[PDB]
C-alpha cells in the first residue's frame, strides 16, 4: 500500500491509464480499477489516488481514484448516494422520503 | 625467489605485508583482500602515520595482475601486552560503493527500455565501467524500488534472465551467460592435489521445478494475463518425485519463466556437486579444467567457481578451488 | 506577490502575500579573477578617488 | 584487601561466588550480570536447596552500587563426573519485565498526547520508576502495534526523536539526549592501557542520508502531506559519495526528520571508530574521558559506551570499555 498524487489520465483500449507522482511513478500506470464509479478529472488537479501492488511486485500496482478533498459532501444522517466528483451540490440521493435529484437542468435521451 | 606475489597501494610498495589473502568469488558482486602489516612505535619519540582510510590497492600474482580494489577501505590496528603489535588492512573491488550504497535513479521507474539500458543507468552515478557481453532483453516495464541497494536490484533483474554478475580481476562489472572459456591445467591427483572434498547432496535437489506470474503488457488481462502464464521445466538427473513451485516477480513472458527456471537448475546442479582442491604453489575463476581422482570416478571436464591466494610468515604457501559443473 | 505556506498551522490564513516590494539582494560568491583586478585597482593610482 | 566487590541476594552476602561478571551497555534497555557458585552434597544427608527463581540482587563494587537487578532470572546448575559440581544464576534490569512483556495498554490508540506521556502509561503497569531529563515532544497521532512488546514500542518512538534508552544502576529506565557530562579519568597509554584495539570501518558510513514521510495532521492532505515533507542531512566528514534513503515511521514533520536523520549520524559515526581497552584494577557508562594511543595518534575526548567487570578465582581482575567520540 502507497500514496501518490494524480496529474495525468488517458484513455486506452483496457481501462484507463493514469501518472499519479510520487517520484515519476510510471508514465504509463496500469489501468486503474473501475468498481461502477469513475471519473476523468482535468491535468494536475487537488486529487490522490492510493496505489495496491500486486502481491509485493512493484511491477504491478492498481490506482484507487478519490474524490477531491475540498469537494466531499457532508451528506446528512441516515443518507447516501454519489455525487458529481468536483462539486458537492449537484448529487443523487436515496433517502427514506424520495428518491432526491439535484441540479440546475435535466436532460435525458 | 622471483617475488611471486607484489602488493601496491596507491604506488607505494609494501615491503612488509607479513601475511596475505586474496579472495575471487564468482557467486557474489566484488572480490576482497586483506594484508597484515608489522607497524612500530618507540615512546619519547616522533612517529608517522598514514591511516589512509582509502586509495587504490593492486596485487600482482607472479608478475601478473589478480585483483583491483578501492582499497583501505577498513583499518584496524591490534595489539597486545605480549606477541607484538600489527596492523591489518583490507579491500575490495571498485565496485564496493555499489555493494553499500542506494540509488539515487532520477525518476525512479522506467517506461520501456532493455536491461542493457537500464543497468548503464543506474552504476553509472559512480565512475564504474560496465563489461557487457550477455544477450540483450527488451521488457514492457522496469521500477526499481523505492531505496533498494545496487547490488540488490541487479542481482535481482540478472536472476530471471541467467545472467550471472561477478566482478572482473581489472575493476570492471562483468555480467555474462557462461563460461569464459579460457582452459586452465589438468589437475591430477597425485600430481599436485593436497587435499580434496567431495559432495553430492539430495537436499538441494528438484527433478520438477514449476514458474508462474502474471503479465503487465501494454494492454493484456484476463485468462491470457492470469492462468495462461505457466511452465514447467525438469532436470531429470534425480530420478525421484521432488516437485518445487516457485513465484515469478516481474511481467511474465513465456520465453523468461524459462529462462528463470534454468537459472535455479544450474544453481541447484552446481550446490549438488560441490569440490574442494588445495593446489600448493600459487589463472582465473571460470575456466575449465580437468581432474581425476578414481576413488570417486571423477573423470569429467570441470569449471572453477571460486579461488584464493593464501600466505604465511611461516612459509605456508597454498591455493583453494569451489568446482562445480 | 503572492505566496503561501508550506507548513500549515492551525488559526493562521492558508495565504499570505509580502509587501510592495519584492524579495532581492541576493549574490553569488567572488571568483579569483574578480578579486584580483579589484585589489590591484585599489592598489594603484587613480585621480578623484 | 577490603573487598572490591561484594554481592547481595535478598539481603544474605554471597560468601561463596568463584567468579563474578557485570555488563552495562549504553546501546541496550538493560544490564545483566553473572555468577558461579560452590555447592556440596553428601550421600545420604541431608541438604537445604532453595532454588530462587526470583528476588533482588545487588551488586557493589568498592564500596559503590554498581547494579540493581529482578534476580534470579536464571538458574542451572553444571555438574561433572570429573571436575567438580557447582551453580550459575543470572540477572538482569528491573525492567526486565518491559524486556520480555507484551503491552497491555488500557485502549491502544493515542488521540493527541506527548512522547513522555505515553511512556509513563506504558511502563507504568509494571511500576518501574521512569527517570526523564530529555525534551518533550507533541505527536498528533500515536497507535501502539496490537500485541508489540514495550522494549520495541519504546525504542522504535524513541529512534525517531534522538532519545538515548538505557538503565542507570539503582533500578531506573533513563531518557537523555546526550551525555551525563561525569567527567573520568585521562586513560593514557604506558599508564595504565593493557590491551586496545582501534578501528574505522568505510562500510559503515554515509555522506548524505535522505528520509520521506507523508503527514497526518487533522487536516493536511495534497501536496502539502505526500511530496512536500522531504530532508537531507549530510555528515560532510567522509570525502565521498555513499548515498542513503531513509522511509519514516510515523507523522513526518520537517523539525521531525532531520532528527531522526541526526541519531542515524550518530549512530554511523560511532559505529566507525569503535575502541576496546583493558584497564587491570576494578565509574559510569557514557563518562567523559581524555585518551592517549600516539602510535595511531588518538588526543580526541571520548565517551563511554559499554562497562563491564570480570573476576575468576586464580586472581585475574579486569575491566573493559567500549568508546567511541
Given at each position: 500500500?502507497?500514496?501518490?498524487?494524480?496529474?495525468?489520465?488517458?484513455?486506452?483500449?483496457?481501462?484507463?491509464?493514469?501518472?499519479?507522482?510520487?517520484?515519476?511513478?510510471?508514465?504509463?500506470?496500469?489501468?486503474?480499477?473501475?468498481?461502477?464509479?469513475?471519473?476523468?478529472?482535468?491535468?494536475?488537479?487537488?486529487?490522490?489516488?492510493?496505489?495496491?501492488?500486486?502481491?509485493?511486485?512493484?511491477?504491478?500496482?492498481?490506482?484507487?481514484?478519490?474524490?477531491?478533498?475540498?469537494?466531499?459532501?457532508?451528506?446528512?444522517?441516515?443518507?447516501?448516494?454519489?455525487?458529481?466528483?468536483?462539486?458537492?451540490?449537484?448529487?443523487?440521493?436515496?433517502?427514506?422520503?424520495?428518491?432526491?435529484?439535484?441540479?440546475?437542468?435535466?436532460?435525458?435521451? | 625467489?622471483?617475488?611471486?606475489?607484489?602488493?601496491?597501494?596507491?604506488?607505494?610498495?609494501?615491503?612488509?605485508?607479513?601475511?596475505?589473502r586474496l579472495q575471487?568469488?564468482?557467486?557474489?558482486?566484488?572480490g576482497s583482500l586483506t594484508v597484515?602489516?608489522?607497524?612500530?612505535?618507540?615512546?619519547?619519540?616522533?612517529?608517522?602515520?598514514?591511516?589512509?582510510?582509502?586509495?587504490?590497492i593492486?596485487v600482482?600474482?607472479?608478475?601478473?595482475?589478480?585483483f583491483?580494489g578501492?582499497g583501505?577501505?577498513?583499518?584496524?590496528?591490534?595489539?597486545?601486552?605480549?606477541?607484538?603489535?600489527?596492523?591489518?588492512l583490507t579491500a575490495r573491488?571498485?565496485?564496493?560503493?555499489?555493494?553499500?550504497?542506494?540509488?539515487?535513479?532520477?525518476?525512479?521507474?522506467?517506461?520501456?527500455?532493455?536491461?542493457?539500458?537500464?543497468?548503464?543507468?543506474?552504476?553509472?552515478?559512480?565512475?564504474?565501467?560496465?563489461?557487457?557481453?550477455?544477450?540483450?532483453?527488451?521488457?514492457?516495464?522496469?521500477?526499481?524500488?523505492?531505496?533498494?541497494?545496487?547490488?540488490?536490484?541487479?542481482?535481482?533483474?540478472?536472476?530471471?534472465?541467467?545472467?550471472?554478475?561477478?566482478?572482473?580481476?581489472?575493476?570492471?562489472?562483468?555480467?555474462?551467460?557462461?563460461?569464459?572459456?579460457?582452459?586452465?591445467?589438468?589437475?591430477?591427483?597425485?600430481?599436485?592435489?593436497?587435499?580434496?572434498?567431495?559432495?553430492?547432496?539430495?537436499?538441494?535437489?528438484?527433478?520438477?521445478?514449476?514458474?508462474?506470474?502474471?503479465?503487465?503488457?501494454?494492454?493484456?488481462?484476463?485468462?491470457?494475463?492470469?492462468?495462461?502464464?505457466?511452465?514447467?521445466?525438469?532436470?531429470?538427473?534425480?530420478?525421484?518425485?521432488?516437485?518445487?513451485?516457485?513465484?515469478?516477480?516481474?511481467?511474465?513472458?513465456?520465453?523468461?519463466?524459462?529462462?528463470?527456471?534454468?537459472?535455479?537448475?544450474?544453481?541447484?546442479?552446481?550446490?549438488?556437486?560441490?569440490?574442494?582442491?588445495?593446489?600448493?604453489?600459487?589463472?582465473?575463476?571460470?575456466?575449465?579444467?580437468?581432474?581425476?581422482?578414481?576413488?570417486?570416478?571423477?573423470?569429467?571436464?570441470?569449471?572453477?567457481?571460486?579461488?584464493?591466494?593464501?600466505?604465511?610468515?611461516?612459509?605456508?604457501?597454498?591455493?583453494?578451488?569451489?568446482?562445480?559443473? | 506577490?503572492?505566496?503561501?505556506?508550506?507548513?500549515?498551522?492551525?488559526?493562521?490564513?492558508?495565504?499570505?502575500?509580502?509587501?510592495?516590494?519584492?524579495?532581492?539582494?541576493?549574490?553569488?560568491?567572488?571568483?579569483?579573477?574578480?578579486?584580483?583586478?579589484?585589489?590591484?585597482?585599489?592598489?594603484?593610482?587613480?585621480?578623484?578617488?
Amino acid at each position: 500500500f502507497e500514496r501518490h498524487v494524480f496529474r495525468k489520465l488517458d484513455h486506452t483500449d483496457t481501462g484507463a491509464i493514469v501518472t499519479v507522482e510520487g517520484s515519476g511513478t510510471m508514465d504509463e500506470d496500469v489501468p486503474v480499477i473501475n468498481s461502477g464509479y469513475g471519473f476523468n478529472p482535468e491535468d494536475d488537479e487537488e486529487l490522490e489516488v492510493f496505489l495496491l501492488s500486486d502481491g509485493s511486485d512493484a511491477s504491478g500496482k492498481f490506482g484507487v481514484m478519490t474524490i477531491p478533498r475540498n469537494k466531499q459532501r457532508k451528506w446528512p444522517k441516515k443518507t447516501g448516494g454519489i455525487q458529481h466528483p468536483f462539486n458537492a451540490d449537484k448529487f443523487v440521493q436515496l433517502d427514506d422520503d424520495s428518491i432526491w435529484l439535484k441540479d440546475g437542468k435535466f436532460t435525458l435521451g | 625467489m622471483i617475488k611471486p606475489m607484489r602488493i601496491f597501494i596507491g604506488g607505494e610498495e609494501l615491503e612488509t605485508y607479513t601475511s596475505a589473502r586474496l579472495q575471487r568469488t564468482k557467486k557474489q558482486l566484488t572480490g576482497s583482500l586483506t594484508v597484515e602489516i608489522f607497524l612500530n612505535y618507540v615512546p619519547s619519540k616522533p612517529v608517522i602515520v598514514n591511516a589512509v582510510r582509502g586509495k587504490e590497492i593492486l596485487v600482482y600474482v607472479m608478475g601478473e595482475l589478480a585483483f583491483t580494489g578501492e582499497g583501505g577501505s577498513d583499518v584496524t590496528v591490534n595489539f597486545a601486552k605480549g606477541q607484538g603489535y600489527s596492523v591489518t588492512l583490507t579491500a575490495r573491488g571498485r565496485t564496493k560503493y555499489l555493494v553499500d550504497s542506494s540509488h539515487s535513479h532520477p525518476t525512479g521507474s522506467f517506461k520501456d527500455t532493455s536491461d542493457r539500458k537500464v543497468i548503464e543507468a543506474l552504476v553509472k552515478e559512480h565512475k564504474v565501467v560496465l563489461d557487457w557481453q550477455g544477450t540483450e532483453v527488451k521488457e514492457p516495464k522496469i521500477t526499481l524500488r523505492d531505496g533498494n541497494r545496487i547490488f540488490n536490484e541487479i542481482f535481482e533483474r540478472c536472476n530471471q534472465n541467467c545472467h550471472f554478475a561477478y566482478e572482473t580481476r581489472d575493476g570492471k562489472l562483468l555480467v555474462t551467460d557462461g563460461t569464459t572459456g579460457v582452459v586452465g591445467e589438468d589437475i591430477v591427483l597425485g600430481q599436485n592435489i593436497l587435499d580434496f572434498s567431495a559432495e553430492q547432496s539430495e537436499d538441494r535437489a528438484n527433478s520438477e521445478i514449476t514458474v508462474k506470474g502474471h503479465r503487465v503488457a501494454k494492454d493484456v488481462w484476463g485468462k491470457n494475463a492470469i492462468v495462461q502464464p505457466v511452465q514447467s521445466v525438469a532436470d531429470s538427473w534425480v530420478g525421484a518425485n521432488i516437485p518445487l513451485t516457485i513465484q515469478h516477480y516481474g511481467d511474465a513472458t513465456n520465453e523468461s519463466l524459462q529462462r528463470r527456471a534454468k537459472f535455479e537448475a544450474d544453481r541447484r546442479a552446481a550446490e549438488s556437486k560441490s569440490v574442494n582442491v588445495t593446489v600448493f604453489h600459487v589463472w582465473d575463476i571460470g575456466n575449465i579444467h580437468y581432474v581425476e581422482i578414481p576413488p570417486e570416478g571423477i573423470f569429467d571436464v570441470m569449471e572453477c567457481v571460486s579461488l584464493t591466494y593464501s600466505v604465511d610468515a611461516k612459509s605456508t604457501l597454498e591455493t583453494q578451488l569451489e568446482l562445480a559443473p | 506577490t503572492e505566496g503561501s505556506l508550506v507548513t500549515p498551522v492551525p488559526g493562521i490564513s492558508s495565504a499570505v502575500t509580502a509587501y510592495g516590494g519584492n524579495f532581492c539582494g541576493g549574490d553569488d560568491a567572488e571568483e579569483c579573477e574578480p578579486f584580483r583586478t579589484r585589489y590591484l585597482q585599489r592598489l594603484q593610482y587613480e585621480p578623484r578617488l
